[PDB]
Design an enzyme around this catalytic site. Structure first.
Site, PDB file in Angstrom:
ATOM      1  N   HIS A   1       0.661   1.335  -5.723  1.00 38.36           N
ATOM      2  CA  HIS A   1      -0.645   0.689  -5.680  1.00 38.36           C
ATOM      3  C   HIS A   1      -1.744   1.687  -6.053  1.00 38.36           C
ATOM      4  CE1 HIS A   1      -4.270  -1.296  -4.374  1.00 38.36           C
ATOM      5  NE2 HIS A   1      -4.454  -0.419  -3.401  1.00 38.36           N
TER       6      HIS A   1
ATOM      7  N   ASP B   1      -5.644   5.317  -0.375  1.00 39.88           N
ATOM      8  CA  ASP B   1      -4.826   4.688   0.663  1.00 39.88           C
ATOM      9  C   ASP B   1      -3.781   5.657   1.226  1.00 39.88           C
ATOM     10  OD1 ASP B   1      -5.850   2.025   1.038  1.00 39.88           O
ATOM     11  OD2 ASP B   1      -4.926   1.402  -0.863  1.00 39.88           O
TER      12      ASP B   1
ATOM     13  N   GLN C   1      -4.303 -17.625  -2.422  1.00 39.07           N
ATOM     14  CA  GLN C   1      -4.624 -16.786  -3.570  1.00 39.07           C
ATOM     15  C   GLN C   1      -5.855 -17.347  -4.268  1.00 39.07           C
ATOM     16  OE1 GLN C   1      -3.362 -14.020  -2.881  1.00 39.07           O
ATOM     17  NE2 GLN C   1      -2.476 -13.486  -4.880  1.00 39.07           N
TER      18      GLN C   1
ATOM     19  N   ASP D   1      -9.182  -1.423  -7.144  1.00 36.06           N
ATOM     20  CA  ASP D   1      -8.330  -1.623  -5.976  1.00 36.06           C
ATOM     21  C   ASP D   1      -7.715  -3.028  -5.924  1.00 36.06           C
ATOM     22  OD1 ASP D   1      -7.085  -0.884  -3.525  1.00 36.06           O
ATOM     23  OD2 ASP D   1      -8.868  -1.414  -2.365  1.00 36.06           O
TER      24      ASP D   1
ATOM     25  N   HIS E   1       0.796  -1.222   0.000  1.00 36.37           N
ATOM     26  CA  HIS E   1       0.000   0.000   0.000  1.00 36.37           C
ATOM     27  C   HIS E   1       0.827   1.270   0.000  1.00 36.37           C
ATOM     28  CE1 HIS E   1      -3.097  -2.902   1.355  1.00 36.37           C
ATOM     29  NE2 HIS E   1      -3.911  -2.102   0.687  1.00 36.37           N
TER      30      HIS E   1
END
Ligand SMILES: CCCc1nn(C)c2c(=O)[nH]c(-c3cc(S(=O)(=O)N4CCN(C)CC4)ccc3OCC)nc12
Ligand SMILES: [Mg+2]
Ligand SMILES: [Zn+2]
Length: 326
Positions: free
Chosen positions: A83, A120, A283, A230, A79
């Site tokens: 990003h 963010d 994942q 995002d 972050h």
């Protein structure tokens, strides 16, 4: 020198969207320098005609972009500025190549690009693993989206900073409208709110009731789109997704080590550096439980957003193979 960076940015030529490849859902930023990402961001405001329709001064936009970049912590593994930049790039690609652009107003597009870049801000690498916190019987007892409120405050602060006011050319009303849209777009990035509202969104689509003229649905849609952008790292070409996945893992492990010292608790596999072997299975789980449905729903909204879903599926196949340990 911060001024040295500004002078360089404001004086550089902004290459075309095509040369920059900011139109590709497969876009990668790994080979770009901070300056180049800034140039890409300018090309985004320009080609979405935000600079023109809202009379933004070149130097002021450059300054605002540099201020936003500066307020991200480079020390946080995932972050960080990159990003946010990628989120905005995905938003740009969705609006253009995904054709979401003509379903929104000029203000909403303005708010979305700004939100994508600012969602963010000043993130410290703190993540909430409890993904079902919004559906708990007592969810209303623990204030939600605390950090997201901070991100917005930061966003608003930078917008009102002398020399950084890209929204100065707006009317008193346009400004109020734009700020509300931004605030909601930013708060929508709290994954918990995505979990809470996705069901409603999916059903509107499943039953063919989806109607963007209904303000409530427009807002819900903008929230889903923010989430889609995002999380878009999960839709990237294999080699790129792998590297991005490493960064996510690294921020998780860092938290695990930090909480071990501050809370005297051992980390769950998610945040345990000794458990990298379980990443692919996680994942696949992340993709199935969170991503697939979102990108599928988005494809129903606009068939041209299909590549996000497609890329996501390919990554599932890759991660699954590894999960089964080849
Ligand atoms: C807050 C981070 C959101 C996110 N973005 N991206 C691209 C990813 C990703 O690739 N993987 C995960 C991820 C999610 C889960 S989860 O679906 O089980 N779940 C728990 C953790 N929260 C933060 C996300 C949801 C478990 C492991 C993950 O990364 C493995 C390297 N989160 C994100
Ligand atoms: Mg966030
Ligand atoms: Zn984010």
């Amino acid at each position: 020198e911060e001024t040295r960076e500004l002078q360089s940015l404001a004086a550089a030529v902004v290459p075309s969207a095509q040369t920059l490849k900011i139109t590709d859902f497969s876009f990668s930023d790994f080979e770009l320098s901070d300056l180049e990402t800034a140039l890409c961001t300018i090309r985004m405001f320009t080609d979405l005609n935000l600079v023109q329709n809202f009379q933004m001064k070149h130097e002021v936009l450059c300054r605002w972009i540099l201020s936003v970049k500066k307020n991200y912590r480079k020390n946080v593994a995932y972050h960080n500025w990159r990003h946010a930049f990628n989120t905005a790039q995905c938003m740009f690609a969705a609006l253009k190549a995904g054709k979401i652009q003509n379903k929104l107003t000029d203000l909403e597009i303005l708010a979305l690009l700004i939100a994508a870049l600012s969602h963010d801000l000043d993130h410290r690498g703190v993540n909430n693993s409890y993904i079902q916190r919004s559906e708990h019987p007592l969810a209303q007892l623990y204030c939600h989206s605390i950090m997201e409120h901070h991100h917005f405050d930061q966003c608003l602060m930078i917008l009102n900073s002398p020399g950084n006011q890209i929204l100065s050319g707006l009317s008193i009303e346009e400004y109020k409208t734009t700020l509300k849209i931004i605030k909601q777009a930013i708060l929508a990035t709290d994954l918990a709110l995505y979990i809470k509202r996705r069901g409603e969104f999916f059903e509107l689509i499943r039953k063919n009731q989806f109607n963007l003229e209904d303000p409530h649905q427009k807002e819900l849609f903008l929230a889903m789109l923010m989430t889609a952008c995002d999380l878009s790292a999960i839709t990237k070409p294999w080699p790129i997704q792998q590297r991005i996945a490493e960064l996510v893992a690294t921020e998780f492990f860092d938290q695990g080590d930090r909480e071990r010292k501050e809370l005297n608790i051992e980390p769950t596999d998610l945040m345990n550096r000794e458990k990298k072997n379980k990443i692919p299975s996680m994942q696949v789980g992340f993709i199935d439980a969170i991503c697939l449905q979102l990108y599928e729903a988005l494809t129903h909204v606009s068939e041209d957003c299909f590549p996000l879903l497609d890329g996501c599926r390919k990554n599932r196949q890759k991660w699954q193979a590894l999960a089964e340990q080849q």
